[PDB]
Design an enzyme around this catalytic site. Structure first.
Site, mmCIF file in Angstrom:
data_model
loop_
_atom_site.group_PDB
_atom_site.id
_atom_site.type_symbol
_atom_site.label_atom_id
_atom_site.label_comp_id
_atom_site.label_asym_id
_atom_site.label_seq_id
_atom_site.Cartn_x
_atom_site.Cartn_y
_atom_site.Cartn_z
ATOM 1 N N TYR A 224 23.671 -5.097 5.834
ATOM 2 C CA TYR A 224 23.442 -3.661 5.865
ATOM 3 C C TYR A 224 24.753 -2.940 6.069
ATOM 4 C CZ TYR A 224 20.613 0.558 6.419
ATOM 5 O OH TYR A 224 20.029 1.792 6.244
ATOM 6 N N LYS A 225 24.720 -1.618 5.978
ATOM 7 C CA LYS A 225 25.942 -0.835 5.957
ATOM 8 C C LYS A 225 26.784 -1.130 7.182
ATOM 9 C CE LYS A 225 23.330 2.704 4.752
ATOM 10 N NZ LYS A 225 22.466 2.127 3.686
ATOM 11 N N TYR A 226 27.994 -1.634 6.946
ATOM 12 C CA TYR A 226 28.765 -2.231 8.024
ATOM 13 C C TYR A 226 29.083 -1.214 9.094
ATOM 14 C CZ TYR A 226 32.551 -4.261 10.598
ATOM 15 O OH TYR A 226 33.360 -4.724 11.609
#
Lengths: 103, 438, 148, 310, 497
Positions: free
Chosen positions: E1-3
């Site tokens: 997922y979005k870091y």
DNA sequence: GTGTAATCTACTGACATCAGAGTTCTTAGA
DNA sequence: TCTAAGAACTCTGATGTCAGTAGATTACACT
């Protein structure tokens, strides 16, 4: 109070309001130091913290009762240290007490 | 005027609790302030705005200098210094009583903050402030020497300094010399060494990708620096040679550079200080001239504006140069007087390119008179019949005058500037053309 | 997502409801031009949602309104307008406390919307059915003062 | 260094063990001394460091006013150095004590977490010790287990846990030790798998193609009927090209005064490249590869040649 | 997922008179249980994921504070990065005197409405600015029916909870303890994602783990090129790293401020300041001195454009484990750069695994770096225990050593053992087996350092003084092996030490 | 010219990592 | 009768990296 100036403290604990300990010291102007180096006069703590246990494990500082400085604030005059006013002492004060105390 | 209430609330925002929340409120409050007091037009209320903005008991500068310990106000600092930048333009030179305090704010912010987002504008404001307050005695009380000390020191902090902030640092080290040369008298040579060296590293690279914006800043600072403290005909084979071959390197787009700061700044360097490089110009004349013309037509309007000035300076310096000696015949009678002649005589090039071409026909009137007098009048003729066919076009609206007869008049001035006799028989034509221009 | 939704709702109110929970939840996150679009989506359907005043104070709608961005202010005062008939007074007072601020604002359209808000206040609260609601009396006084 | 240590198993089976280092990423011996231009004296430069508070650029006294802290969430604990030595995790000393024994596959090739690979041999001149170790080694070997030993170079060094691998050579049996991770060190990642290749789908043409490839380019092939394959790329006997380049550079910079640096000597490149025969074998299989896969584009970068003449 | 996204966990405790003082027996207390859970998880997250977000908010209280000025909900500390100044606040409440303080500051436990409570937590997650990776809500209640009285409140609850489920927020309660009333099908089977009076899920939230993690961060993406024309897009990832302690920061005595080191280099002959250009690198060989440009001192390493250079393939017996050099890395295609390359990666992987042979290559991790020789040993996935990833599928990176590394050993002669003592050593080695799991142990150093950190942070009476599996359990070895040490003494040991 | 896009390039947090520097131990050692 | 030289390890500081974010620059475009 223009007395505690030029005298440098260490209020390492105190929670008696700890952040007000140095404030009361501040209208007396006592020099406030967060972490005691070899320069400082003594260290003040309302309890024991692990840093207190450190500075006990390295006698290079003089470790004080909470009530003593309050008394000096209620003498309106610095009260030079006495056996009850401490809870631990440095080796310079211990060699001084080897002149100045019964063992 | 709501500026006072808004500002008052700004200093309130300092002591609110949810600092990370007070930030947003403060930021667009200060944006509102800017929008209100940049629009202002009445020369009365404008003064009230100014004195409230730079106020003391409150005001934008005190807000900065006191909201500078916190990190929660990065955006607010950014916008407040940007608004200073705009203001400084909007009331040029009026801010005179507050310049010293603005400089102290700028240097303070640069020292304190971390994120470049506040440093960039901070340096920008010093750039603007210096560039606008050159003449006035105010210049002496910026303690410019101390400023040079501080930032020169900044140049050596293990180069951690980010890229764009470094380009502005070089900008300021440069323009610092220009604004007040007197204090730089004993420091300039060091700075030249600095710029030369760091430019060398940053553009004579071996492994690292060229920090393009860094380079642009570097050479523009150099441009500002050469305005005083010249570097021609003294230690030329070292100093001028390095500057010059770097300039060449900048100009040459050895690959298609999608970004334009580097060439643009380089062209400007060459333009304003070819006087230094006049010696070495002739060494690379073919390459320089080629590159410049080829460079004269890219789409970037600012770039074109740079290019024309560059060519103008090139031709001018070459023309001055030949006027002293007689070996560069195999230069004019081999390259110039034929290439720009061929431009004019054949091409369907741009109007601007045609104008620079006619200029070029002119500026070499000198060498023409040095080498062969009998050609001077001939070119005078040729030019004036060019005029006669470019004015008597019988009302060709919207195309012909557009950029030309300014050029031709420039040219005829150039040529007559060295005519020995006067072709009086042609003379009345000339002033007829002059009237036409008028 | 917000842009797509806005373009959808701009000619279709109904679809919004199914997503409006998200519309609100995403509101305070964004900044800049997209804020305008988000609150516009809010506008497209403001006439129906119940307990919108609470949901709206959730995000700092009061502080949202104060921002100098003409379109954002225009949509915000319109939001105020439509939710006017439904909101209980004790909090219409707090909500008009920043609406009254816009007397000094320059966007002529914004001021027109202000005066519309205050017109409605004055028309519908004149001589309230009960004097006990000191909130109602104060609202009437403030509205009258600004409208004068 | 002849490091002797007491291979400890149990509390009553101490054995003197001589530790030796086997593989270490070698670092060049002596650093590039920083020297000033145009004077070429080392002593003319001081890399002095100064510590300055952020406020008004107040300079703080070098080496008695700074006390080290740590980040614990938002705030900084004022730790110290004295408190550091007073609270640091002590240890007895060498303490190469066997925690236990385990299967080969219980530890895996991937997981080795070492700086360097020790070789664990007997302290010389005590034969009975040597045979004792030898018993240890064979027993681990045939029973195909490994040993996990707490390791420590000495005091004031972080302790260390990892495999004790046992090794045999016709000249001598051997035992080698490698760091294996502590838990905080291990990382975990999902890595969406591949045999769900409903988007990648390696068709049989590609399949047998790659078969032909990896057979064809076989860098090793059996020789002498002794299964000692054509390992004419040992990489084990091959000198580190870094050091080759470094000594070459120092040379050319000595035998000449200032001249521009040379390229890589072609024998180094010949050294690093595979022996030609593989390259000869390679063209046809790769040739068939190029027509059997999609190869959409990618990007690239620049250098000084971005604005360097010629 | 979005870091850049972050994991956020809000905390929500039933503050009614319900469990503030249940204390059926005298061994625990449900509020003292929940607060212990919160303190524990929070300190664990401090060290663990210092970048994450936590928040604690009680409901049903008598005093009030929240964003929306609702009734009976109190946000103890908002969503913010974890920090000590918050563990202190939570600790202030741990204790009988602590619970007296809690009750006499905010309330004994008034009426409440979980509909509104969830509303509150929703607004909380909304208010944050950073992006959120996972968003999770933890109730700490036991009134297994929130209210059997006003069903309309219950309908509203289910509605809003479904919404939160749809706004991207999960929710979870651990059933703490109730006399009876230990069920989830009463009103929560439709809320959370058989049953008993205490929650196992809350047990581990006291396990007090304190490593740290980093997400799926590519160490470097480089293009594996089969030849000069075929290239594939590989992400060099990392799977073991030897976490060193977090690097300390330098602070001033009198004020604990950051001190902003300012190292520089300057002249001795004059008080000048050498700018970085004005320095030269040097060596001393053969009594003659050497100069290179600082640029050249790194130019002396340019060897190959960055990437991987597969040459050949090699029989896995030959890649000897005997010569490890640095921690291995992992190989897995990144579809982003060269589209479709994942296919060829899979092809190589499948075929190599099938034909049991390595793949050797040249590794230039970054520019300016000499190359080493690393083998792409393929790895098969394993899932068997619970069909969860264990060894990720792809290629390893076993770095192969270079000649400058062999470190020629000081040859000594061999002495074979006699089959007698080795036959007994078979028994010895058998006895002391133990299965070695990967995450068996911990650094005593890292662990103790972290501990001492919390110790100094929270003004505790004592350091925790962790006991760590690294030290062997001596009595266990003395016992389980028996006195065989004297057996091997009498077999293969004379008098001398 | 004026104004709106698209999109490259920046900076930062953060994480690995070489090198560089501070430190204890064996031999050769007045 | 003992004083350096390497060793080794750890530690610190830069260099370079990657994902993300967002700005400003540059292309595109208007009858």
């Amino acid at each position: 109070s223009n007395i505690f100036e030029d005298v440098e403290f260490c209020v390492m604990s105190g929670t008696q309001p700890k952040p007000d300990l140095e404030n009361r010291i501040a209208e007396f102007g006592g020099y406030i130091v967060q972490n005691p180096g070899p320069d400082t006069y003594c260290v003040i703590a309302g309890s024991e913290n692990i840093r207190v246990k450190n500075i006990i494990l390295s006698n290079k500082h003089d470790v004080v009762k909470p009530a003593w400085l309050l008394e000096c604030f209620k003498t309106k005059s610095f009260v030079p240290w006495q056996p009850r006013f401490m809870i631990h002492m440095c080796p310079s004060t211990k060699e001084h007490f080897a002149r100045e105390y019964d063992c | 005027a709501g500026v006072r209430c808004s500002l008052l609330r700004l200093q309130e925002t300092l002591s609110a609790a949810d600092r990370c929340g007070a930030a947003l409120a403060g930021h667009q409050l200060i944006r509102g302030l800017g929008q209100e007091c940049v629009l202002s037009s009445s020369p009365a209320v404008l003064a009230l705005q100014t004195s409230l903005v730079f106020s003391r008991d409150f005001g934008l500068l005190v807000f900065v200098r006191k909201s500078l310990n916190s990190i929660e106000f990065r955006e607010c600092r950014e916008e407040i210094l940007k608004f200073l930048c705009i203001f400084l333009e909007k009331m040029g030179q009026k801010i005179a009583p507050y310049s010293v305090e603005i400089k102290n704010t700028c240097t303070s912010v640069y020292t304190k903050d971390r994120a470049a987002k506040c440093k960039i504008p901070a340096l920008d404001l010093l750039i603007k402030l210096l560039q606008t307050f050159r003449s006035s005695r105010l210049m002496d009380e910026f303690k410019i020497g101390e400023l040079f000390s501080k930032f020169y020191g900044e140049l050596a902090l293990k180069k951690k300094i980010p890229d764009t902030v470094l380009e502005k640092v070089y900008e300021l080290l440069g323009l610092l010399g220009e604004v007040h040369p007197s204090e730089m008298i004993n420091n300039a040579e060091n700075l030249f060494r600095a710029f030369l060296g760091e430019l060398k590293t940053q553009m004579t690279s071996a492994v690292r990708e060229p920090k393009l914006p860094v380079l642009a800043g570097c050479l523009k600072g150099l441009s500002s620096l050469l305005c005083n403290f010249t570097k021609s005909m003294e230690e030329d084979p070292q100093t001028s040679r390095e500057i010059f071959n770097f300039v060449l390197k900048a100009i040459r787009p050895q690959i298609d550079l999608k970004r334009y700061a580097v060439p643009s700044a380089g062209l400007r360097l060459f333009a304003l200080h070819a006087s230094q490089f006049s010696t070495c110009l002739l060494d690379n004349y073919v390459s320089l001239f080629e590159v410049l013309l080829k460079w004269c037509a890219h789409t970037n309007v600012e770039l074109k504006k740079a290019a024309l000035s560059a060519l103008e300076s090139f031709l001018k310096q070459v023309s001055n140069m030949v006027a002293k000696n007689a070996e560069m015949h195999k230069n004019k009678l081999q390259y110039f007087m034929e290439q720009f002649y061929g431009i004019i005589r054949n091409v369907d090039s741009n109007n601007k390119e045609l104008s620079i071409a006619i200029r070029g026909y002119g500026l070499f009137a000198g060498p023409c008179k040095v080498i062969n007098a009998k050609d001077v009048d001939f070119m005078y003729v040729e030019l004036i019949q060019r005029c006669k066919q470019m004015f008597l076009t019988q009302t060709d609206t919207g195309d012909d005058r557009v950029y030309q007869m300014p050029s031709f008049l420039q040219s005829v001035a150039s040529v007559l500037l060295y005519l020995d006799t006067v072709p009086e028989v042609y003379t009345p034509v000339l002033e007829h053309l002059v009237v036409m221009q008028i | 997502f917000i842009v797509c939704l806005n373009k959808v709702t701009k000619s279709f109110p109904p679809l919004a409801d199914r997503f409006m929970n998200a519309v609100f939840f995403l509101l305070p996150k964004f900044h800049g031009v997209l804020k305008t679009l988000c609150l516009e989506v809010v506008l497209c359907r403001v006439e129906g949602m119940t307990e919108l005043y609470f949901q709206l104070k959730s995000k700092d709608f009061v502080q949202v309104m104060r921002h100098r961005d003409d379109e954002r202010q225009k949509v915000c005062l319109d939001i105020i307008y439509k939710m006017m008939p439904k909101l209980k007074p004790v909090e219409l007072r707090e909500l008009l406390n920043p609406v009254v601020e816009f007397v000094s604002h320059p966007s002529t359209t914004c001021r027109e919307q202000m005066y519309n808000i205050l017109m409605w206040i004055h028309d519908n609260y004149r001589d309230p059915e009960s004097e006990t609601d000191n909130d109602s009396q104060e609202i009437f006084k403030l509205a009258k003062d600004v409208l004068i | 260094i002849h490091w002797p240590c007491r291979l400890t198993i149990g509390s009553n089976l101490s054995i003197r063990i001589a530790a030796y280092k086997s593989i270490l990423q070698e670092r060049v011996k002596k650093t590039w001394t920083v020297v000033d231009a145009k004077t070429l004296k080392k002593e003319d430069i001081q890399k002095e460091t100064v510590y300055c508070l952020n406020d008004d650029d107040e300079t703080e006294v070098l080496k008695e006013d700074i006390i080290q802290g740590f980040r614990y969430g938002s705030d900084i604990v004022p730790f110290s150095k004295v408190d550091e030595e007073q609270m640091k995790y002590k240890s007895e000393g060498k303490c190469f004590s066997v925690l236990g024994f385990c299967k080969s596959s219980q530890v895996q090739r991937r997981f080795f977490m070492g700086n360097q690979v020790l070789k664990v041999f007997a302290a010389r001149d005590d034969e009975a010790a040597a045979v004792a170790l030898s018993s240890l080694i064979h027993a681990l070997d045939d029973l195909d287990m490994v040993a996990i030993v707490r390791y420590a170079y000495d005091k004031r060094a972080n302790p260390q846990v990892g495999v004790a691998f046992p090794h045999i050579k016709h000249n001598y049996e051997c035992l080698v030790y490698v760091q294996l991770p502590f838990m905080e060190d291990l990382r975990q990642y999902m890595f969406s798998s591949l045999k769900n290749s409903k988007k990648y789908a390696p068709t049989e043409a590609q399949l047998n193609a790659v078969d032909a490839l990896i057979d064809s380019m076989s860098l090793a092939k059996k020789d002498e009927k002794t299964d000692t394959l054509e390992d004419l790329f040992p990489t084990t006997k091959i000198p580190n090209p870094r050091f080759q380049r470094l000594f070459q550079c120092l040379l050319h910079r000595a035998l000449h005064p200032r001249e521009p640096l040379p390229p890589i000597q072609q024998h180094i490149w010949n050294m690093l490249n595979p022996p030609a025969e593989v390259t000869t074998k390679s063209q046809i299989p790769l040739s068939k590869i190029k027509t059997l896969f999609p190869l959409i584009e990618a990007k690239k970068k620049d250098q000084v040649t971005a604005q360097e003449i010629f | 997922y979005k870091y850049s996204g972050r994991d956020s966990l809000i905390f929500l405790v039933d503050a009614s008179k319900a469990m503030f003082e249940s204390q059926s027996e005298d061994e625990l207390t449900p509020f003292d249980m929940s607060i212990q859970c919160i303190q524990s998880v929070y300190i664990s997250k401090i060290i663990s994921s210092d970048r994450d977000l936590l928040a604690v908010v009680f409901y049903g209280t008598e005093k009030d504070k929240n964003s929306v000025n609702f009734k009976n909900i109190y946000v103890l500390q908002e969503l913010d990065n974890p920090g000590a100044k918050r563990i202190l606040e939570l600790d202030q409440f741990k204790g009988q005197q602590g619970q007296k303080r809690f009750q006499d500051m905010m309330g004994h436990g008034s009426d409440y409405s979980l509909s509104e409570v969830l509303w509150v937590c929703a607004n909380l997650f909304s208010d944050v600015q950073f992006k959120m990776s996972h968003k999770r809500i933890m109730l700490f209640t036991n009134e297994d029916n929130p209210h059997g009285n006003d069903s309309a409140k219950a309908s509203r609850a289910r509605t809003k909870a479904g919404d939160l489920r749809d706004t991207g927020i999960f929710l979870d309660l651990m059933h703490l303890k109730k006399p009876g009333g230990f069920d989830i099908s009463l009103f929560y089977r439709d809320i959370i994602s058989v049953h008993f009076e205490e929650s196992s899920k809350l047990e581990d939230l006291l396990r007090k783990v304190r490593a740290k993690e980093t997400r799926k961060r590519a160490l470097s993406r480089l293009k594996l090129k089969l030849n000069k024309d075929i290239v594939i897009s590989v992400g060099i990832y990392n799977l073991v790293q030897k976490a060193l302690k977090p690097p300390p920061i330098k602070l001033y005595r009198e004020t604990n401020e950051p001190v902003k080191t300012k190292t520089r280099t300057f002249n001795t002959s004059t008080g000048g300041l050498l700018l970085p250009s004005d320095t030269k690198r040097s060596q001393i060989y053969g009594s003659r001195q050497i100069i290179l440009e600082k640029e050249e001192t790194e130019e002396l390493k340019r060897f190959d454009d960055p990437g991987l250079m597969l040459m050949g393939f090699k029989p896995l017996v030959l890649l000897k484990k005997h010569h490890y050099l640095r921690p291995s890395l992992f190989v897995y295609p990144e579809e982003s750069l060269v589209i479709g390359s994942s296919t060829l990666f899979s092809a190589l992987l499948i075929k190599c695994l099938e034909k049991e042979v390595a793949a050797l290559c040249r590794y230039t991790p970054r520019r300016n770096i000499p190359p080493y020789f690393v083998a792409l040993v393929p790895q098969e996935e394993e899932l068997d225990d619970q069909k969860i990833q264990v060894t990720p599928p792809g290629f390893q990176l076993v770095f192969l050593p270079f000649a400058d590394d062999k470190r020629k050993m000081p040859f000594t002669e061999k002495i074979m053992a006699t089959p007698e003592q080795v036959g007994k050593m078979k028994a010895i080695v058998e006895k002391l087996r133990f299965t070695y799991r990967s995450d068996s142990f911990e650094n005593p150093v890292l662990q103790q350092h972290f501990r001492n950190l919390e110790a100094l942070a929270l003004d505790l009476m004592e350091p925790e003084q962790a006991v760590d599996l690294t030290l062997p359990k001596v009595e266990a070895m003395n016992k389980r092996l028996g006195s065989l040490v004297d057996e091997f003494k009498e077999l293969v040991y004379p008098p001398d030490y």
